[PDB]
Chains A and B, each alone.
With several copies, the nearest count.
Chain A
Amino acid sequence: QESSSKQIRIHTHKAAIISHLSWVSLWLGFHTLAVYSHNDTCIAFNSPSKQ
């Protein structure tokens, strides 16, 4: 429990770090792939202006 070392303080809440990193990774992947897929689908359908 001695929260003195920096690695100690990082390890105390390591689950929070990893969970938030997973959240931001999921957000970026979802919203980049989905917008790219929107553009791909709407430009395959002869609609460049629907991107």
Chain B
Amino acid sequence: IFRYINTTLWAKAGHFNKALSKGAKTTTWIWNLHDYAHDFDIQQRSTGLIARKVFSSNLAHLSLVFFWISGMHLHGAYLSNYDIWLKDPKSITPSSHLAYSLIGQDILNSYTSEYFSGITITSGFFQLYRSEGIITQSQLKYACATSLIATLICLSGSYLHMQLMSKFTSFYKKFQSLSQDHLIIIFGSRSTSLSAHQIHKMLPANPLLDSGISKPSILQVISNSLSYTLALFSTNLSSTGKLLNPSTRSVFLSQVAAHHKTTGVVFITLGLIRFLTMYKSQFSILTSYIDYHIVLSINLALIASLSIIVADHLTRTPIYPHKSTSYPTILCLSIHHAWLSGFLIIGSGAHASIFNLLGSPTSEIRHRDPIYSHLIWVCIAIGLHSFSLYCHNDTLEALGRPEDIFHDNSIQLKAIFAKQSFLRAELQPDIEMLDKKIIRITQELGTADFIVHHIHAFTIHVTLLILSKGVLYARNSRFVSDKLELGFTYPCDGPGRGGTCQISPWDHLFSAVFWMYNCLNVVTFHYFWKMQSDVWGFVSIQKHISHYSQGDFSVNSITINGWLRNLLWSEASQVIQSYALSSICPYGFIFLIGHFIWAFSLMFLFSGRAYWQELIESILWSHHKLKIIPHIQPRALSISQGRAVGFIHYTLGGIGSTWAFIISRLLVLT
């Protein structure tokens, strides 16, 4: 069985694809080898190998994630100031990340504690550890050990399943079994397990810390043995979320444990219900969507939506102790999950297109013109409406006519449904604050919030237009009637019919990545400006609030010039003036590098490969002149690869620019 696991193919690069068997005649062979590496569908051998590869690769990636978790745990146990952060979280910035004293890189470590200098981490791992009752270094040691053991176990399982599974293997196709066991045993039987963990280790510990005994009598009290504290020790009646814990500025962990217990019960009951529930309508979906790419797209869309829900729920539904006051942590936790939501949504669209090209589509593709046409009209309507309210405000403010602009002190567009959406939270008529820092105050939504929400809707709709147009017009179109034979990813069909560049679903993803990036850059900026202007900030003992941006949002965000001046210029002073400043030197440098990479992408985005091919031939003349012949013949990047490289550099550079801009400012202000 395992005697066929041989290294003889390690030296034979490109073995998996039969199109690469001719050998590396040109440099295009290298890029094709890298491109087809994970494309198990088109690789050689039967369908059973596809299942084995998919499952074992999933296990290998799971081992990789476990290794990353183990690295974070070891950094927290042996390369961090988590001790002093535990003792005083409101005066110590989290830091489990040092820099070596080479090339003066010592300037990157900054004062986080009197005994520690390092890079302020914004992953929120310290708050997670405190919410996980991790106090001693031994606990982090054993967490790291368990994560390393999990890495080894998952790696070994990925190794084994390449030969345990065979041609007869069918457990992956049993979707009823997968859904039932997943749902019940994981969402139900593991949620209650975490509820048990919290009830037996957090409530014995986190109340002890909040009770002021950071000593906890060392292990005499902290090491469990506290069955005289009661599970609902400090619920204080009320409703979950209406009253926060005054000490840690978060929801009481007893309520979180009850939530996990009840959610596990609900999931178990739903698994029991699924024995007899509503069906026979999603049944066409049931039979037509049993394929790798469709389920991958469905899961990607679902996980991305969950990621955006997490992004919006991690900030002003504070669960973690001492996390609402840690403003850089809140900002990072929102924005990182926002970006992941966008990226995984785009991936869902791509794999929907791939499923359409490999499998057979459904009924909705036959009236695709009305669908992707009313989508076009709605995109045009909300683009010519949302953005232009900004253009109108801008023009009339430049003209000196502020009474004719869309503002609160002018023609005002009230957010009617949001203002009547006091259902969410429904907190008492005041704010909450822990230590000179605002925990959460209700965002008073006005005209600017209305306009920016419509901008969000417009960008979302345009990205969805690109994605659905790629998906629905994958097999064929009025433009080209045999797009199915062209495959999933192709540069074009030729300069004929006026020009057929970028008709493939791959190119539709290529444009959709740009539009998703543009969509949630505005989301990032809206969050980053709104929180600073209207939520975060200092306090005055006379109940007066001094925010970080001093309420710039409601008065400046009504015009594009307001965004340019009060957000991208005034709030970029921290990152731009960050040279020789200990903590924020890398952020200024990375700001510069992000600008460089973003501009560098434009060389690939704007140019075609024929010019570069001719230039490469001109250079190859000089190489052949001096008897330097590369027998792997130099070829310029393929059209699809040029577009991919351009998109990757564009998004990476822009994301790095925002990343530095937000993080350096929040680190300086805090």
Task: Report A's interface with B, CB cutoff 8 A.
Answer: 14-16, 18-20, 22-23, 40-47, 50
Least CB distance from A33 to B in Å reads 9
Interface majority SS on A: helix, strand, loop or mixed? helix
B585 and A40 contact, CB distance less than 8 A: no
Q: Is B100 an interface residue (CB 8 A)?
A: no
Q: Is B233 an interface residue (CB 8 A)?
A: no
Beyond A45-B103, A46-B107, list 12 extra A-B contacts (CB 8 Å): A14-B618, A16-B622, A19-B621, A23-B622, A40-B589, A40-B592, A43-B579, A44-B578, A44-B580, A45-B580, A46-B104, A46-B585
Q: Which residues of B contact A14 (CB under 8 A)?
A: 618
Residue of A nearest to B621 (CB): A15
Which 10 pairs, one residue from A and one from B, show the smallest C-beta to C-beta distance? A15-B621, A45-B104, A19-B622, A18-B618, A46-B580, A44-B579, A44-B585, A45-B107, A15-B618, A46-B107
Least CB distance from B206 to A in Å reads 41
Binary A-proximity of B601-622 (CB < 8 A = 1, otherwise 0):
0000000000000010111011
Least CB distance from B586 to A in Å reads 8
Least CB distance from B100 to A in Å reads 13
Docked complex: B545-599 residues within 8 A CB-CB of A: 578-580, 585, 588-589, 592
Q: Which residues of A contact B580 (CB under 8 A)?
A: 43-46
Least CB distance from A37 to B in Å reads 9
Q: Is B156 an interface residue (CB 8 A)?
A: no
Q: Which residues of A contact B592 (CB under 8 A)?
A: 40
Q: Is B44 an interface residue (CB 8 A)?
A: no
For chain B, the bracket of interface size reads: 10 to 19
Residue of B nearest to A47 (CB): B104
Least CB distance from A45 to B in Å reads 4
Q: Is B105 an interface residue (CB 8 A)?
A: yes
B621 and A41 contact, CB distance less than 8 A: no
Task: List 20 interface pairs A-B (beta carbons < 8 Å), by A numbering.
Answer: A15-B618, A15-B621, A16-B621, A16-B622, A18-B618, A19-B621, A20-B622, A22-B619, A23-B622, A40-B589, A43-B579, A43-B580, A44-B107, A44-B579, A44-B589, A45-B105, A45-B580, A46-B107, A46-B580, A50-B104
Least CB distance from A41 to B in Å reads 7
Least CB distance from B607 to A in Å reads 15
Least CB distance from B117 to A in Å reads 14
B589 and A22 contact, CB distance less than 8 A: no
Q: Which residues of B contact A16 (CB under 8 A)?
A: 621-622, 625
Q: Which residues of A contact B107 (CB under 8 A)?
A: 44-46
Residue of B nearest to A43 (CB): B579
Least CB distance from A18 to B in Å reads 4
Q: Which residues of B contact A45 (CB under 8 A)?
A: 103-105, 107, 580, 585
Least CB distance from A44 to B in Å reads 5
Q: Which residues of A contact B618 (CB under 8 A)?
A: 14-15, 18-19, 22
Least CB distance from A23 to B in Å reads 8
Residue of A nearest to B589 (CB): A44
Residue of B nearest to A50 (CB): B104
Whether A41 contacts B589 in the complex (CB less than 8 A), given A22-B615, A46-B107, comes out as: yes
Residue of B nearest to A41 (CB): B589
Whether A19 contacts B104 in the complex (CB less than 8 A), given A44-B585, A44-B589, A46-B580, comes out as: no
Q: Which residues of A contact B105 (CB under 8 A)?
A: 45
Q: Which residues of A contact B622 (CB under 8 A)?
A: 15-16, 19-20, 23
Residue of A nearest to B108 (CB): A45
Least CB distance from B440 to A in Å reads 36
Q: Which residues of A contact B589 (CB under 8 A)?
A: 40-41, 44
Q: Which of B588, B617, B621 contacts A44 (CB under 8 A)?
A: B588
Residue of B nearest to A22 (CB): B619
Residue of B nearest to A13 (CB): B621
Least CB distance from A30 to B in Å reads 14
Residue of B nearest to A18 (CB): B618
Q: Which residues of B contact A20 (CB under 8 A)?
A: 622
Q: Which residues of B contact A15 (CB under 8 A)?
A: 617-618, 621-622
Q: Which of A18, A47, A50 contacts B615 (CB under 8 A)?
A: A18
A19 and B103 contact, CB distance less than 8 A: no
Q: Which residues of A contact B621 (CB under 8 A)?
A: 15-16, 19
Q: Which residues of A contact B104 (CB under 8 A)?
A: 42, 45-47, 50
Q: Which residues of B contact A43 (CB under 8 A)?
A: 579-580
Q: Which residues of B contact A44 (CB under 8 A)?
A: 107, 578-580, 585, 588-589
Least CB distance from B634 to A in Å reads 13
Residue of A nearest to B624 (CB): A15
Least CB distance from A29 to B in Å reads 12
Q: Which residues of B contact A18 (CB under 8 A)?
A: 615, 618-619
Q: Which residues of A contact B579 (CB under 8 A)?
A: 43-44
Q: Which residues of B contact A23 (CB under 8 A)?
A: 622
Q: Which residues of A contact B578 (CB under 8 A)?
A: 44
Residue of A nearest to B587 (CB): A44
Docked complex: B60-117 residues within 8 A CB-CB of A: 103-105, 107
